Amino acid sequence: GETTDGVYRVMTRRLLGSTQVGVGVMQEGVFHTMWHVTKGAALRSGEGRLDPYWGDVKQDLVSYCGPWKLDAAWDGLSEVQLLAVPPGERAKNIQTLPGIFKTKDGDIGAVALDYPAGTSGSPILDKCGRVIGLYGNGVVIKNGSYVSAITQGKRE
Amino acid sequence: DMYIERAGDITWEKDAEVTGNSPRLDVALDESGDFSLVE
Ligand SMILES: COc1cncc(-c2ccccc2C(=O)Nc2cnn(C)c2)c1
């Protein structure tokens, strides 16, 4: 199927019509998405099959066809862009200054942008276009809006 | 059954819409990969 680098929609035909369950990143022949999008199931790309290669429910990440390739990190200072791919809508870049999730094991960047759940897996980019993490795993604040972590894997 | 469809190139866009705030939140991450607010 298609193995060109870029952002992709993750669709399903199990429910009514064609439904977008999430988004992913194809880089160096490896497809990267969030675990809650596919639950580790195999994917189709045209007539080709993509098999899971690595995954972890606690990190909420999964890679297909090879190991996790994305290793860029938020510098902790600069604005970033969420390349939002909402269901039935065109890919759109939204620039924001990340906040921070403070945890017992360290700080993580966080993006306060609200999108449908089917947008999970959209990449967050630095000024050089490098993917510093994926959007879609976070928390609901007092306001009712979602604040997502900048979730990044480890390039082994 | 799940399938993928290309949606675009991964590039930084100059003069993109700038929005969203930068909240500092104390959070906890459980074994199931769910974040929760600590207060
Ligand atoms: C329908 O109302 C919502 C309620 N809660 C969250 C969302 C949401 C919004 C933006 C991006 C991702 C999500 C989301 O569902 N994230 C997620 C993380 N782990 N799981 C299992 C689901 C939506």
CA distance linking residue A94 with residue A112, whole number of Å: 11
Query: Quick check: is A154 in a domain?
Result: no
Same domain, A54 and A104: no
Query: Quick check: is A144 in a domain?
Result: yes
Reported resolution in A? 1.5
Same domain, A112 and A136: yes
Among A61, A146, A148, A151, the mutation site with the greatest number of ligand 1 atoms within 8 A of its Cβ is: A146
Reduced to 3 states, what is the DSSP secondary structure of residue A72? Answer: coil
Instruction: Find where tokens 């880089």 sit.
Output: A27
CA distance linking residue B26 with residue B16, whole number of Å: 30
> Looking at ligand 1, which residue's alpha carbon is closest to its atom 9?
A117
- Domain with A86 in it: what CATH number? 2.40.10.10
Cβ <8 Å between B10 and A79: no
Number of structural domains, chain A? 2
CA distance linking residue A67 with residue A55, whole number of Å: 9
Please count the residues of chain A: 156
- Domain with A28 in it: what CATH number? 2.40.10.120
What the block records as the tokens of A1 is 């199927």
Q: What was the experiment behind these coordinates?
A: X-ray
Query: Quick check: is A10 in a domain?
Result: yes
Query: Which residue in chain B has the smallest CA separation from A89?
Result: B7
Same domain, A14 and A60: yes
Same domain, A48 and A86: no
- Beta strand A123-125 pairing with A6-12: unpaired
Please, what is the end-to-end C-alpha distance for chain A in angstroms?
26
Q: Which amino acid is at A155?
A: R
CA distance linking residue A145 with residue A55, whole number of Å: 28
Which has the closest alpha carbon to A60: A155, A156, A144, A148?
Answer: A148
Which has the closest alpha carbon to A110: A143, A134, A127, A144?
Answer: A134
- Shortest Cα distance from B39 to chain A (angstroms)? 12
- Supply the range of the domain harboring residue A46: 6-64
What the block records as the tokens of A23 is 């988004």
Same domain, A88 and A133: yes
